[PDB]
């Protein structure tokens, strides 16, 4: 999409609102540049010393400083935000900031398409304010549609802060309403957790095909990549040692004949295969006809069984598909809904022979529906081939006369289980709540990568980017369950022996430490 965001900051440093505002704006801009979102942002500085306004409407706009117009951020912009912007001394007026912000927006709306509009104003409300131009500012707000994400230091605020709070909540309820009160947050805490960690999103595309239930009776369907082990968007670029570009960098082979220095070229190779004691020659041109021929992007379903026979253990593949119908095909949609309701009622799972396209591979798959009040479709997971069914005989454990847990150990384990429950127990309100929801936490590898990137970028001489402790906080459960299980841990360690281990991995070498 596209977003239009304006920035405004609140002497001016009086903890200090200036430091929190600078921290949050630097964090926001670094998150934008790391996510590489396609949206430009504008920066306006009201209250900074000096009347350097872009447009001087009678010099009524005091201390208005448009540091940056609506432009795509970069590392240069982030360091400019870190360095150049310093607190002012004389109070400014909110009307000037709003008027200049929407003037910049209107100037920048000519030339660039925008799919979203936002406003990010930060003020301690200690600056003197006058409420005289409500009509024009509210008209501009409802025209430019800049969704105000305003933030406050925090109530026991001062009279100037009280008047600022009441005018801002009045203008929000006039414009937006309750959400206008909601979008106002504290400079710390709420805003601190709002943008401390980022996320990434790689959008997939529909799989417009036909569900072939039966010989004919096909049903138009569209499928999407639902759950996927995410990969990094950008791979590392191996650049030159000193040029730092791609001049002496290339991937190439020699294909020297195993001899005495004779070599071979690409046309000289044959794609043989190790047929046991020897290698039979073979070529891709031979593969062209000596290969299975698929039939387009078929969605052939072949079998139906009970949900009991299948196993969550036997869930294979590397992706998940929400099997939806096609676009606005009401007959197909209701037919699919009836079919999935029938399958759910009978617990009657389906077997699907899937192929992504003509060049794809046949894929046996299990089909069972998912039903919610917001989305209703079918879930598809790749079923195995009998080659995948690896078998390894294992000795029984419940009959281990040599290792039989004592009943004291059993009760200690019970106490441990009860203490380290990581989910809220379902009370009379059905409070089956995940105290440690893993699915809502992004992969820490990417946040660590971006932390290292900023560490090296903003300071090229900084050798080692440290691990974020907040990641450890995200990577560790609340200490309540740990403290509860501490005593059961003591019981277990007293009730369970062990012997020594090996493979003591060490650092590369023992330099000065």
């Amino acid at each position: 999409n596209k977003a239009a965001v304006v920035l405004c900051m609140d002497t001016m440093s009086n903890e200090s609102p200036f430091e929190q505002a600078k921290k949050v704006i630097t964090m926001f801009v670094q998150r934008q540049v790391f996510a590489e979102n396609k949206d430009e942002i504008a920066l306006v500085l009201f209250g900074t010393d000096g009347t350097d306004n872009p447009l001087s409407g009678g010099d009524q706009y005091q201390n208005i400083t448009v540091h940056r117009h609506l432009m795509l951020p970069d590392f240069d912009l982030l360091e400019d935000i870190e360095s150049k912007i310093q607190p002012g001394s004389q109070q400014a007026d909110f009307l000037d900031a709003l008027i200049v912000s929407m003037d910049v927006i209107q100037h920048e709306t000519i030339g660039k398409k925008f799919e979203k509009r936002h406003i990010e104003i930060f003020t301690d409300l200690s600056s003197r304010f006058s409420k005289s131009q409500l009509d024009i500012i509210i008209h501009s707000l409802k025209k430019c549609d800049i969704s105000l994400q305003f933030f406050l230091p925090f109530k026991g605020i001062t009279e100037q802060q009280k008047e600022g709070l009441e005018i801002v909540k009045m203008v929000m309820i006039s414009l937006e309403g309750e959400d206008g009160l909601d979008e106002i947050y504290s400079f710390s805490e709420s805003l601190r957790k709002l943008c401390v960690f980022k996320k990434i999103e790689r959008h997939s595309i529909h799989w417009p095909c036909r569900l072939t239930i039966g010989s004919n009776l096909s049903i138009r369907i569209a499928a999407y990549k639902s759950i996927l082990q995410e990969r990094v968007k950008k791979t590392w670029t191996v650049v030159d040692a000193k040029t730092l570009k791609k001049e002496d960098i290339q991937k190439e082979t020699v294909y020297c004949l195993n001899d005495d220095e004779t070599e071979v070229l690409k046309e000289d190779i044959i794609q043989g295969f190790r047929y046991g004691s020897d290698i039979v020659p073979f070529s891709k041109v031979d593969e062209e006809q000596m290969k299975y021929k698929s039939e387009g992007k078929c969605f052939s379903v072949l079998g139906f069984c009970k949900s009991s026979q299948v196993q969550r253990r036997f869930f294979m593949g590397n992706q998940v598909l929400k099997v939806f119908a096609a676009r606005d095909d009401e007959a197909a949609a209701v037919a699919l809904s009836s079919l999935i309701h029938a399958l759910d009622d009978l617990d009657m799972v389906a077997i699907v022979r899937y192929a992504y396209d003509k060049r794809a591979n046949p894929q046996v798959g299990v089909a069972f529906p998912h039903i919610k009040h917001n989305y209703e479709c079918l879930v598809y997971v790749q079923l195995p081939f009998m080659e995948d069914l690896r078998q390894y005989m294992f000795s029984s454990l419940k009959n281990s006369k040599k290792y039989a847990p004592t009943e004291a150990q059993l009760n200690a384990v019970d106490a441990l289980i009860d203490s380290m429950s990581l989910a809220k127990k379902d009370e009379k309100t059905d409070t089956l709540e995940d105290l440690f929801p893993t699915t809502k936490i992004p992969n820490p590898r990417f946040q660590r990568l971006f932390q290292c990137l900023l560490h090296r970028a903003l300071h090229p001489r900084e050798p080692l980017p440290p691990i974020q402790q907040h990641i450890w906080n995200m990577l560790n459960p609340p200490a309540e369950v740990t403290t509860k299980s501490q005593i059961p841990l003591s019981k277990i360690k007293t009730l369970f022996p062990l012997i020594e281990a090996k493979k003591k991995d060490q650092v590369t070498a023992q330099e000065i430490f």
């Binding site: 020699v254 046991g276 277990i492």
Partner: protein, 475 residues
Amino acid sequence: YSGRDSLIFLVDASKAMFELTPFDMSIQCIQSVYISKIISSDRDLLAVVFYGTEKDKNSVNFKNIYVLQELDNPGAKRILELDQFKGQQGQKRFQDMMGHGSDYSLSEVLWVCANLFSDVQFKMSHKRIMLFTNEDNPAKASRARTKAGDLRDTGIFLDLMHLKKGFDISLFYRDIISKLEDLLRKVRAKETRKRALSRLKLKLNKDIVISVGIYNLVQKALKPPPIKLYRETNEPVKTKTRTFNTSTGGLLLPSDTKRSQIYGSRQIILEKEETEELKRFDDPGLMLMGFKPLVLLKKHHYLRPSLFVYPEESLVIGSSTLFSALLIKCLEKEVAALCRYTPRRNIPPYFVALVPQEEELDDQKIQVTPPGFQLVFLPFADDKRKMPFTEKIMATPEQVGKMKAIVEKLRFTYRSDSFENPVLQQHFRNLEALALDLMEPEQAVDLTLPKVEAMNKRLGSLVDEFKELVYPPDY
């Protein structure tokens, strides 16, 4: 794992299986077994020895005993040697250079088999012998039975079915021994593995750990990697390949490799060392977080195939005891273990659910759901994907009832191993045909084409009757 199963094929030549003739499908089954072995496992050994002929080709030079293939890894040349006698003209030429039925002694053939078994210079896990004859031939019988008993005591297994069909002719071999239809290439492109995954430590808390044996059970199969054989000599090249200096000329070095990502304004140039150290977060193992109910699962968040977890009483003793206790507790508890798991160094952690895997021994004591736990990957926030809203229309009770009647008419038991990959099967068949200088072997769909295309009339299709839209929904 060291040691394999040794099977040797012994077939009588007594001009009684020459009359389809028992010799014919005996040779066919031997060829099919050899093909299945060469496509399945190469560490095994095969041997072909015949007796009763007019020639005495064997190490100790015993009468009527002919050896053709000794104990060795399966090879295409052995397949061609078998095939040259497969036909009826092959049968007669075989009888020519080998000799028709003649006098012999089962003691001698068992002695030759024992010598051949001793000839191998490897630890050989199991020793089995397959023998073929139409009727039992048998003095000679006493010594033969005594020698057979001695060999059975030495650790030799025997196998045989009379080639008349029923259960009529095994009289002279009732005690000698301790069905080939399934061996007629019914299994193809089998894969066999014996190793195990990397054993780790279960970091359940800050001080005590459990030596856990990791086991993959359903890992994805794939075709063997191709080799870059030469065009004429048909042998691979040394494949020398590494970046050197081209723009400036010369040779590049690993120390010269700088990595960067052009982001925004500038390219953040770094080296590899930062890249690997970025991937490092903790030590290998499973750092336990706690327990979470199995009911608290999204039921549709599979991303990587599950891996079995087993005790390994080799580094701590508490593995077996504590795992048995937990599995006993897994009866009462439906909560699942939450663990931060890293297979090895420099790996980002993944949250792991330990679904209780309790052993379910059947009448034959099949290790269904082996005793332990399976690793269940839990997706991150970024692993989730957005989904456009869709709450257009519901279904009607009439429609759901009609769909129920349509679907439950057709039900399947869903045998797990009932399907194999058509691509891999066709690839193996093509390699087999090329290795034997033949035509296209065959095409056999692994039920990929639904069988419902012909039995839809058999199940009484009714959705064709029930076209809910006047305009054909299936245009």
